[PDB]
Design a protein around this ligand. Structure first.
Ligand code: HEM
Length: 453
């Protein structure tokens, strides 16, 4: 079987097709025309984009395929190092950090982080309670303040105090700029061009700003001896079951930077898309609000009450179905293998899972794939294996899944309890693509139900 492939441009191959600010959406369009698999070549590289549950379930076989570091991840590694997200599975530090961190990220472990999550969530709610009549909310902007501050506090007991500032903490400014630079290098035709000397200089400065803060906090903690309810305390005290070794200080720093750079943007996007879909679907919003009011009966949510927000959970899963905020992951063939009984692959061949397209597979989800219908997830164990993959696959899946969902469910629950929301501009969905996805420029008005915290 010959494999479909979009337009080529001479020696540049398919590369010009991704000369756009929205490449994932462009690839979804190509997938719409070419089907479940297409080859994509650039000067000196080749990948194949998968879109069907049929082929993705095979790609998800860990005996056959392992996580690949995409070019995007190789650039992010310049500041995320050998943290979990940017490591090869066979690097010693991957398995070691994975073993140590798994217990710190369990559903049970979320009880320990809940109070800090509530701290920041209350700050968001109070911010919105305190807006004057003529004001509005910049949704992704505020969700980003929320998620960064939450990961800072739960991550290493540090307050960025984002809700006290117009200009973010310097660490945050550097982080966002470093992420942007790693992204720009993907579409940069002539990297050695002197017009990029300043970018390179700035990138090194921003890496230093991030390293200096995190290294200082780690050093301060070891000198103080203080024990906290945070990830840092877990990483300082944890020992690998296999070797009995703890993580060294540099790797701990990379883990912290990783939780921030990856966790903040994905979770902020999710909350933003969820609110977007709620305001665009009033009947669904009514059902979510009814549950929030019924369940969240105390001045602040308890850990247990968050799990009881069953419909809110479904709303978030349905937002992740339509716009999974980390929209792709990359795999390599471990050995020569045949995919789908039709496509021969050689050892090391690279595959890309196009998640938003997977989540629109009509053979799994039915015809109404574009409809926002949380009720799809009423019985979540009834959805076929490998049909729904917003958190990636297997041992290389999101270690932060329970953290992200606890945070998102808590915060969306509180928003729904405390406010009526208005799509005051009839916002037109504009999805900005970076390492992640977000609804750019999404704004609302929130009218308080005047319920005290
Ligand atoms: C809704 C929000 C989130 C989504 C959609 C998401 C999605 C993903 C995906 C798709 C991967 C696999 C990437 C790949 O295969 O290349 C991943 C990995 C990872 N995530 Fe998340 N993530 C979210 C939130 C978080 C948070 C809040 C944290 C930490 C506080 C986190 C920490 C990590 C780590 C450490 C990895 C690498 C795990 C490993 O390979 O051992 N994520 N995530």
């Amino acid at each position: 079987k010959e494999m479909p492939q979009p337009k080529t441009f001479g020696e540049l191959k398919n590369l010009p097709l991704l000369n756009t600010d929205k490449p994932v959406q462009a690839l979804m369009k190509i997938a719409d025309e070419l089907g479940e698999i297409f080859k994509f070549e650039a000067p000196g590289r080749v990948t194949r984009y998968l879109s069907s549950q049929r082929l993705i379930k095979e790609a998800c076989d860990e005996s056959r395929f392992d996580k690949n570091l995409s070019q995007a991840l190789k650039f992010v590694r310049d500041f995320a190092g050998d943290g979990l997200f940017t490591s090869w599975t066979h690097e010693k530090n991957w398995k070691k950090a994975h073993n140590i961190l798994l217990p710190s990220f369990s559903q049970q472990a979320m009880k320990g982080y809940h109070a800090m999550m509530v701290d920041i969530a209350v700050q968001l709610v109070q911010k919105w309670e305190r807006l004057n009549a003529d004001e509005h909310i910049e949704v992704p902007e505020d969700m980003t303040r929320l998620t960064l501050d939450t990961i800072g506090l739960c991550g290493f007991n540090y307050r960025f105090n984002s809700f006290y500032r117009d200009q973010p903490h310097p660490f945050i400014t550097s982080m966002v700029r470093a992420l942007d630079e790693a992204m720009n290098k993907l579409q940069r035709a002539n990297p050695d061009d002197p017009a990029y000397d300043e970018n390179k200089r700035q990138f090194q400065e921003d890496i230093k700003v991030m390293n200096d803060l995190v290294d200082k906090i780690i050093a301060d903690r070891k000198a103080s001896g203080e024990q906290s309810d945070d990830l840092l305390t877990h990483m300082l005290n944890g020992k690998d079951p296999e070797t009995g070794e703890p993580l060294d200080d540099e790797n701990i720093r990379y883990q912290i930077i990783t939780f921030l750079i990856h966790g903040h943007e994905t979770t902020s996007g999710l909350l933003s898309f969820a609110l977007y879909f709620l305001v665009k679907n009033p009947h669904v919003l009514q059902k979510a609000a009814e549950e929030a009011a019924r369940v969240l009966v105390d001045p602040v949510p308890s850990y247990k009450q968050v799990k009881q927000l069953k419909y809110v959970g479904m709303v978030l899963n349905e937002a992740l179905r339509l716009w999974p905020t980390a929209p792709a992951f990359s795999l390599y063939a471990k050995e020569d293998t045949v995919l789908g009984g039709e496509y021969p692959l050689e050892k090391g061949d690279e595959l890309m899972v196009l998640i938003p397209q997977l989540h629109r597979d009509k053979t799994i989800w039915g015809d109404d794939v574009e409809e926002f219908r949380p009720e799809r997830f009423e019985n979540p164990s009834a959805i076929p294996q490998h049909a729904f993959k917003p958190f990636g696959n297997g041992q290389r899946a999101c270690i932060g899944q329970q953290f992200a969902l606890h945070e998102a469910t808590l915060v969306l629950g509180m928003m729904l309890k405390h406010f009526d929301f208005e799509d005051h501009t009839n916002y037109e969905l504009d999805i900005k693509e970076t390492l992640t996805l977000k609804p750019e420029g999404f704004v609302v008005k929130a009218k308080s139900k005047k319920i005290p915290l």
